[PDB]
Design a protein around this ligand. Structure first.
Ligand SMILES: CC1=CC(=O)c2ccccc2C1=O
Ligand SMILES: CC1=CC(=O)c2ccccc2C1=O
Ligand code: FCO
Ligand code: FCO
Ligand code: F3S
Ligand code: F3S
Ligand code: F3S
Ligand code: F3S
Ligand code: F3S
Ligand code: F3S
Ligand SMILES: [Mg+2]
Ligand SMILES: [Mg+2]
Ligand SMILES: [O]
Ligand SMILES: [O]
Lengths: 513, 322, 322, 513
C-alpha cells in the first residue's frame, strides 16, 4: 500500500511522508521536506556576521543553537579569542535552549500521539490520555508551560529567546550581572525541581544519572512510586506496553558533532582543536565502532533533493541551487532536504542519525577526558535493546538531567569580573566551521568569508542528517530507515510514522533552511 | 473563537515565542479563553487527511474560522506557483488565499508573514512576501485592499520573532470582547505595542540622552548606548520590547545587543549588507546615517553635541555592574 | 545558611514584597537554596517561648545565625528605651544589638531598617533609626563601624518596600557561593541593583531626554516624563526598578507614578512637606530645584532647552496608548 | 493560670497576648499591640496628599487598601470627581490586594497552625501536615506562591505592589493600556483557575457561590471528591474534626464600612453618598440587627491604650499622643492599639468585629441594590452555627470567588478610551473620610486639611477594631472576647490563641500605625 501522509505535523515545519506498507509494516519510506527559504543563498554576499542574525531564523526552537555554531564559525574563521565566561554563556544558553526543547517537544510535539486510539486497549491508555492529551494533559500543561523557563535564562544573557544574536565572534554581547546569574540559577533550579525532577523523573537528577544500564533504567522505574508514575517512568512503561521499543530503530549509526566547550580548552576556537575541547563529546558511532568526528568527512548529496548537483559536496564548497519541485520530481527528487552523508572508513558516505541518541553513544565512547561527558548508559541500551522510538526519546530526556547539571555548574563557573568578549579582528578572509549539538543533534555551519563578505555559507542541520532523502546510492536517510519496519495499524491515522519522525524531534525548518 | 495557525516560510520562532507566553500561557489561552485552536503545525494533533479535513472545512466555509494566524512568508516561488512551500497537498499560498478570505480575522505573526522578513531578503529565492506587505510596501500577497470578514486588514504582529504578548494579548482582547480597543498603525500593527519604541524603556536611554556610546561587546555593554557603534535601531523601531520584556527577563538592548529593528517592515535593514551588522552607519565617521524617528540630523547632532558636554560622570562609567 | 528575619518599626511591606519573589520564589528560596529561615514574624511557626528560644539561641550564640534580616526601623523611643517596639519580652533594639552582633551577615531590608524611612520622618515619635544609617548620615543604631562576623557592614537593601529580587538575589548569591560578587555602594546597597537609576529603563526617558512633561495623571501619563510636574526622582534615585520590573509587570514611573526616591536614604524626601508630594520643586516655576544626579542646573537647563527645540513630534504625543 | 504569649507571630506585626486560663479555657484575654510608629503624628503638617505615600506604609499586605481609602479621603475632602475607570481601577486593585492576602494569609499565617501537634490524633492530621506544613506544605507552596498573582494586576495599574501611591484625588495616576487589562484578566484567570478553583475550591467559583446556607457548604464539601479534598473542603472538615468551629466566636457584632464603589454612583465622592455607592456593602450587624454604617458613630478610646485621652474621640478630632508603656501599664494600659468603638443605638459604644465575616453579614442585610453584594450565606451560617475561627475563616475565603468575579467584571467594565483621572482642586481646606474593606475589614481614614496642610489624620484599621484593647467600660475587644472561651490544650504552645487571633487575619502594624 502506497500511503502519502501530508501534513505530518509537529515536526517544526512542513513534512510529507510517503511510505510503502506491506502487511501493515512500512517497507519503504520517503521523507519530503516541502518548504524552502534559501537562507544559505540569502547569506551569500552579506556581512560576515549576518549568519548571527539569519541562522537563528532557520528555526525558532533551535535558533540559539544556530547562533552558537554560527558564532563559532566566525570565531574559527577569524581566529578569535573566546573568554572563558563567553564560552560558559554560550554553553549555558545552548543547553538552556535544549532544556526548553526537551519538554516542549516531548509534550507538545511527541507525547500527544500516545493518546492515539491505536493504544486504546492499553491498560495505561487512560493515564496517557490524562497526562499527554493536547492542551489539557496533566503532564502536557506543566511540561509545556515550564519549558519556557530555561529560555528565560537564555534571555537573561541573550536579551530574548527566540531571536537573539548575542553570541558574536570574540564572545557574547552581554555582560551578565550578579542578579542575572543568581536569577538564572533560580530559574534553572525551579524548572529542574518543578518539571524535571517532580514531573519528568519523580526523583532527583542525580538518581536518574546513576542509571548506567538499561536494567538500571528498568529498576529505576520500579524502584518506587514516584519514579514509576513519573512521566519518564510512565513513558518507559507505556512504550514497552504499546510497542514503541519495537520499531523506529533506524540506521543504528550516529553522528555527534558535540558542543559545550570547556572554557579553558577553546579560548582560541579552531576547527582542529574543537573535538578535544568539547564537553558533550563529538563522535561517529557506525558499525558498532566509535569514530572521531571530522567535518571534512561531511558531504551533502542532492540527488533526491530539489537542488542542482551531481556529486556530494563538502559544505565549504557546497551549493544551494534550487530546482523546481515539478522538474525535480521528474528526476526522482522528492525533498528540499539535502542528504548529508559522513565518510566512515570502510563504509563510505553513510547516513548518520543525529540527535540526543547520537550524543549518548558518543558520550559512551572510550578515552573521555575529565571535562568530557562519559556515560555508558546508551551503549548498554543500544546493545541490550537497540535503538527505537523509546530509546531515541529516552536519550533526549536523559540529557535534561545531564545538561541541567552542566548548566548549573557553568553558572557557578562564571567569573563575573572577567571578560565576556574579546574584540576580534573582522578579517576580510576566513573559512570557519562552527558546530554544536542543537536539541536535535549535530548542527554545523561551514562559512567562507572573502572580501569582507559571505562567499559561501552552508548549514547542515541535525534533521537534514536524519530526514535527508536517499543519497546517490539510494541509501535511505536515518528517519526513512527508521520509518521502514514501522507498523501501521490505521492507514487513515498513521501515528506510527509520526512517532518515528517525531522521535527524532524532526525540525523541517532546520532541515531545509 | 476558532484559531487556525499556519506556517509558510516560517522558522516557527513566533510559535516558540508564543509558547513562552505568560499571563496568559499558551495552554490557558488555548483552553481557558474560548480560543479553539483547530490546528497548528507545531501543536496540532491531526496529521495527513485528518488535518486536511480541518483545513478544507475552514477554507471552504464548512466550519467557522474566526482567526487565521499565518506565520512565515507567503512563498510564491518558483514562478509564482508557491511550490517551494507545499503544505497539505497545495502550495501554502493557495491555503493563505482561501483561509485568509474565510477568516474573520487574519493575523500575520512575525516579520515573515507581516512583511516578508528574512526570507524576503535579496535574492529572495523563495519568492517570499508578507500577507499584506512586502517590506514597507503595502499589498504583499493578499493585496492592499484585503479585509477579513470583520472588515479588518491583516493584523500584523511583527517581530523576528514576535513577542508572545504581542499576539496573546491581542487574542485575549478578542476573546474578552476588547477587539474594539485594538487600534492598528499604518503597518497594521497593534498600537498598544507599537506606538512605543524599542528604546522606550531601554536601560541605556540615559546613555543615549548623553550620547555615551557602548564601545565594545561583553563587559563593554555595562555602560553606554548601542546606537552609535552597534547600529541599534531602537530609536527608529516601534516596539514594546523594553516595556514588555522578552521572556519576562530582558531585551536585546538591555542585554547589550543592538536592536535590529525587527518590528519594522524593512527588517533585516540593509539586507545585512557588509558593514551594516552590529555597526552604526555613519557619515565621515561621526554622523549616523539614520537618526532617531522624528529627528533630523542637524538638531540631533546639535543636541547630541550639547548632550556630550553636559554628560554626567556616571553616564561615562559602568552602570550594569556585577 | 540560617536566616533570622525580625521586624522592628516595620509595615511588613518588604516581607510581602519578598513573598512576591519569583526566580526564586520565597518557598524555593527558603527550602531549595539551603537558607534555613529560623523564624519570621509573618511566617515563623513558633510563638511565645518557643519563638523566644530560637531568638535567644541566635542572640547568645547557642546556634549559628548566618543572616540577620531586619525589617522596619530600630525604635528607640521613649527616651532611648525602645519600649515603643517591644518584641519577645525585650525592646526590639536590644534584639537588634544581640542578633546583629551574632550574625555573619546583617541585611537591612527596606528604608526603615536601612535609614529610618517613613517612621523616621519628623517628629519621629518612635525615635526610629536605621541599623547603620539615619537617613543619609551613617551610624544609625549599630554605629558606623559595625561589621558583621564576616566583616561586612549592614547590607542595606533599601526600598519602601524593597523589591523581592533586591534581597532574594543577594540571598541566592550568598547561598550559591557568590557573596564575593556582591559589591556595596557608600550606602551599603548592592551595586548590582543600585548603580542604575530608577530612570534606567523607564519608559519615559525619551520624554525626559526631550523634556516632554507629563502634564496630568491618568490618561495624561500616556505621554511625557514625570520629572517636571510630578517630582519624579528617578534621575536622582539609584534603583533597578525599571530594569527589574516590580511584580514582573511595571514600575511606578512606567505606570505614571513619579519615583519617590525610596531607595535613597532621604526618603521620604522633604518629609512630604506641603507642595513636595507629586510635584516638582521649581525655581521661578521653570528650573527644577533638583536636577538629575551628576548634572548641574546650568548645563541641564541648557541641554533641556536644546532638547525641547529638537524634540520630535512623537515625544509630544501619547505613546502608552490603549 | 496567667499566660503571657510573646511573640504571637503571623499577625503582621508585634502582638503579645495575655490570657487567664481556668480549667484549660481562656476566661480573660488581653491583646497587647507592642509596636508603634506614629504615622498619624508624622502626617500632621505634611502635604495633604502625604497620606497616599505614608498610609500604605502602615502595612505591607494591606497598604493598597490604605491607599484606596486615603485617596477617597482626599476625594471627599476636595470634592473631587472620580472617573468611572478610576473607580474601577481602585476597586480592582483593592480587591486584587485582598485576593492576594486571602491565600497568603491563609497558608503562610494561619493554616500552618493546623499542623500543630494538638491535632496529632485527628485522622486528617497527616493530610493537614502534608498540605499546610510551613514552606513544604503541598497546599502551602502553591497558595503562597500564587498569592503574588493578584498583586501583579495591582502592579499593572499601580506600577508596583506593595508601595504604590497611584490612587490620587481625582482618580488614578495610571493610564491602563489594552495589554494591561488583558494581562490583568489573564493573571486573574490563571490565579483563579490554578489556586482558587483547582486548589482552594476543587470546583468553579460559580459553584461555590451557589452556597447560600451552611448546609449548602456542608453538602458542597461532600458533593464530590474535588470539593471534598479541596483545601476549602479539607479545611471545613478539619475545622469540624479538630473543633475550630467551637471557639473564637467573639463579640458576634460586626462592622463593615464596605468598599468597591459602583463607578456611576461615586463619581463625586462624598461622605454621605458613600454607603449607597458601595458594592461590597457597608453595614453594622449588632444584637442580631442590621444597621447602616455611619462614620460619625466611630469613636476611638485609649483608656487601656498607650495614648493620652480621657474620653472616646471621633477620629476627625482624634489624637495620637503616646504615653510611655512603663507609665501606661501603671494606669492599666496594655496596648498601642486604640479601642475603636461604634455607637449602636440601644447598645452604646460597642466593639465591632471587622473583617470578611463582618462584610458577609453586611452583604446579607436586606434592601440590597442591584450593584450591591446580596449574599445570605453567612447570615445562615451565623444563625446556624454562629461565629468561630472556622466561620470567620470561611467568610475570608468566601470572598475569593466573590471578589474574583467582581474584579473580572470590573476589568471588562473598563472603558480604556475614557478618563482615569480628573484634575482635582487641591483645596487648602477640607475634611475627608475615606474608608474601604481591606482584607481584614473596615479600614477608615479621617483627614482634616487646613492651610494646605494635614491638620489631622486619623487612621482606624480593621485590626484596631478587632484587636483594640478594652474600652473605658472594660468591654473586651472582639479578638479579646474571641480568645475568651478558647481551649488551651498546651500552655507551652497555645496554638488556639494563634488560631483566634489569626482567624481575624490580625495585622498589628495596621492596628497601631
Ligand atoms: C552623534 C552621537 C554621538 C555619540 O557618542 C552617541 C552615543 C550614544 C548614542 C548616540 C550617539 C550619537 O548619536
Ligand atoms: C527644564 C525641564 C523642562 C521640561 O519640560 C521637562 C520635561 C520632562 C522632564 C524634564 C523637564 C525639564 O527638566
Ligand atoms: N535542534 C535543532 Fe534544529 C534541527 N534539526 C538545528 O540545528
Ligand atoms: N487588611 C488590612 Fe490592614 C489591618 N488591619 C488595614 O487597613
Ligand atoms: S521568528 Fe521565524 S517565522 Fe519569520 S518572523 Fe522571524 S524568521
Ligand atoms: S537607548 Fe537602547 S534601544 Fe538602542 S539606541 Fe540606545 S541601546
Ligand atoms: S530587533 Fe526586534 S525583538 Fe525588539 S529589540 Fe529590536 S524590535
Ligand atoms: S515597606 Fe514598610 S517596613 Fe519600612 S521600608 Fe517601607 S515602611
Ligand atoms: S524618565 Fe522616568 S524615572 Fe521619572 S524622571 Fe522621567 S518618569
Ligand atoms: S519610589 Fe522606590 S520603588 Fe523604585 S520607582 Fe522610585 S526607587
Ligand atoms: Mg544546508
Ligand atoms: Mg489610628
Ligand atoms: O530543529
Ligand atoms: O492588615
Amino acid at each position: 500500500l502506497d500511503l502519502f501522509v501530508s501534513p505530518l505535523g509537529r515536526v517544526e515545519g512542513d513534512l510529507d511522508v510517503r511510505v510503502t506498507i506491506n502487511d501493515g509494516v512500512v517497507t519503504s519510506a520517503w521523507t519530503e521536506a516541502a518548504m524552502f527559504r534559501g537562507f544559505e543563498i540569502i547569506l551569500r554576499g552579506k556581512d560576515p556576521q549576518a549568519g548571527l542574525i539569519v541562522c537563528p531564523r532557520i528555526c525558532g526552537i533551535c535558533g540559539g543553537s544556530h547562533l552558537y555554531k554560527s558564532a563559532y564559525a566566525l570565531d574559527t574563521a577569524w581566529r578569535t579569542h573566546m573568554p572563558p565566561n563567553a564560552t560558559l554563556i554560550r554553553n549555558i544558553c545552548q543547553a538552556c535552549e535544549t532544556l526548553q526543547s526537551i519538554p516542549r517537544y516531548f509534550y507538545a510535539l511527541f507525547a500527544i500521539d500516545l493518546t492515539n486510539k491505536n493504544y486504546a486497549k492499553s491498560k495505561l491508555y487512560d493515564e496517557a490520555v490524562r497526562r499527554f492529551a493536547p492542551y489539557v494533559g496533566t503532564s502536557y500543561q506543566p511540561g509545556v508551560v515550564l519549558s519556557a523557563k530555561p529560555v528565560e535564562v537564555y534571555a537573561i544573557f541573550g536579551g530574548q529567546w527566540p531571536x537573539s544574536s548575542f553570541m558574536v565572534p570574540g564572545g557574547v554581547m552581554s555582560a551578565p550581572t550578579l542578579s542575572d546569574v543568581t536569577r538564572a540559577i533560580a530559574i534553572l533550579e525551579h524548572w529542574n525541581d518543578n518539571w524535571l525532577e517532580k514531573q519528568w523523573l519523580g526523583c532527583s537528577v542525580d538518581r536518574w544519572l546513576e542509571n548506567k544500564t538499561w536494567n538500571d533504567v528498568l529498576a529505576w522505574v520500579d524502584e518506587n512510586e514516584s519514579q514509576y508514575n513519573s512521566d519518564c517512568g510512565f513513558f518507559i512503561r507505556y512504550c514497552l506496553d504499546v510497542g514503541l521499543d519495537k520499531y523506529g530503530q533506524g540506521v543504528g549509526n550516529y553522528l555527534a558533532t558535540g558542543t559545550y566547550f570547556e572554557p579553558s580548552l577553546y579560548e582560541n576556537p579552531t576547527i582542529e582543536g574543537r573535538n578535544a575541547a568539547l564537553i558533550g563529546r563529538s563522535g561517529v558511532f557506525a558499525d558498532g565502532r566509535y569514530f572521531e568526528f571530522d567535518q571534512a568527512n561531511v558531504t551533502e548529496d542532492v540527488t533526491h533533493s530539489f537542488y542542482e548537483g551531481n556529486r556530494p559536496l563538502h559544505p565549504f564548497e557546497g551549493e544551494t541551487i534550487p530546482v523546481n519541485p515539478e522538474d525535480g520530481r521528474r528526476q526522482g527528487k522528492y525533498s528540499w532536504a539535502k542528504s548529508p552523508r559522513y565518510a566512515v572508513p570502510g563504509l563510505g558516505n553513510v547516513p548518520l542519525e543525529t540527535g540526543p541518541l547520537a550524543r549518548r553513544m558518543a558520550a559512551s565512547a572510550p578515552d573521555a577526558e575529565t571535562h568530557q561527558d562519559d556515560d555508558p548508559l546508551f551503549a548498554d541500551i543500544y546493545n541490550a535493546i537497540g535503538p527505537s522510538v523509546m530509546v531515541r526519546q529516552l536519550a533526549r530526556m536523559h540529557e535534561g538531567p545531564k545538561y541541567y547539571k552542566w548548566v548549573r555548574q557553568w553558572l557557578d563557573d562564571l567569573e563575573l569580573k572577567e571578560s565576556f568578549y574579546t574584540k576580534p579582528v573582522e578579517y576580510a578572509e576566513g573559512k570557519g566551521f562552527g558546530s554544536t549539538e542543537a536539541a536535535r543533534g549535530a548542527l554545523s555551519d561551514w562559512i567562507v568569508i572573502e572580501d569582507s563578505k559571505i562567499k559561501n555559507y552552508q548549514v547542515v542541520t541535525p534533521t537534514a542528517w536524519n530526514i535527508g532523502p536517499r543519497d546517490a546510492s539510494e541509501v535511505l536517510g536515518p528517519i526513512e530507515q527508521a520509518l521502514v519496519g514501522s507498523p501501521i495499524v490505521d492507514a487513515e491515522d498513521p501515528v506510527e510514522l509520526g512517532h518515528v519522525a517525531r522521535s527524532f524531534d524532526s525540525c523541517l525548518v532546520c532541515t531545509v533552511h | 473563537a476558532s484559531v487556525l495557525w499556519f506556517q509558510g516560510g516560517a522558522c516557527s520562532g513566533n510559535t516558540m515565542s508564543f509558547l513562552n507566553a505568560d499571563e496568559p500561557n499558551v495552554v490557558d489561552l488555548i483552553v481557558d479563553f474560548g480560543l479553539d485552536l483547530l490546528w497548528h503545525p507545531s501543536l496540532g494533533l491531526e496529521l495527513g487527511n485528518n488535518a486536511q479535513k480541518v483545513f478544507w472545512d475552514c477554507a471552504k466555509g464548512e466550519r467557522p474560522l474566526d482567526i487565521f494566524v499565518f506565520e512565515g512568508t507567503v512563498i510564491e516561488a518558483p514562478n509564482g506557483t508557491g511550490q517551494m512551500d507545499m503544505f497539505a497537498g497545495r502550495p501554502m499560498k493557495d491555503w493563505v488565499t482561501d483561509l485568509a478570505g474565510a477568516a474573520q480575522i487574519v493575523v500575520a505573526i512575525g516579520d515573515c508573514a507581516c512583511f516578508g522578513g528574512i526570507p524576503a531578503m535579496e535574492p529572495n529565492p523563495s519568492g517570499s512576501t508578507g500577507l499584506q506587505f512586502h517590506k514597507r510596501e503595502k499589498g504583499g500577497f493578499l493585496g492592499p485592499d484585503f479585509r477579513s470578514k470583520m472588515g479588518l486588514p491583516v493584523i500584523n504582529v511583527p517581530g523576528c520573532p514576535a513577542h508572545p504578548d504581542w499576539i496573546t494579548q491581542i487574542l485575549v482582547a478578542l476573546a474578552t470582547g476588547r477587539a474594539g480597543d485594538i487600534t492598528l498603525d499604518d503597518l497594521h500593527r497593534p498600537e498598544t505595542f507599537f506606538k512605543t519604541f524599542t528604546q522606550t524603556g531601554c536601560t541605556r536611554v540615559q546613555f543615549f540622552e548623553y550620547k555615551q556610546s557602548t564601545l565594545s561587546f561583553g563587559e563593554g555593554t555595562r555602560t553606554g548606548c548601542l546606537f552609535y557603534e552597534f547600529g541599534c535601531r531602537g530609536p527608529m523601531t516601534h516596539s514594546p520590547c523594553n516595556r514588555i520584556l522578552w521572556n519576562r527577563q530582558s531585551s536585546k538592548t538591555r542585554a547589550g545587543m543592538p536592536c535590529l529593528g525587527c518590528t519594522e517592515p524593512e527588517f533585516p535593514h540593509f539586507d545585512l549588507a557588509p558593514g551594516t551588522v552590529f555597526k552604526t552607519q555613519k557619515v565621515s565617521g561621526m554622523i549616523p546615517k539614520e537618526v532617531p524617528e522624528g529627528t533630523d540630523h542637524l538638531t540631533y547632532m546639535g543636541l547630541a553635541a550639547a548632550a556630550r558636554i553636559a554628560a554626567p560622570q556616571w553616564s561615562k562609567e559602568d552602570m550594569f555592574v556585577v
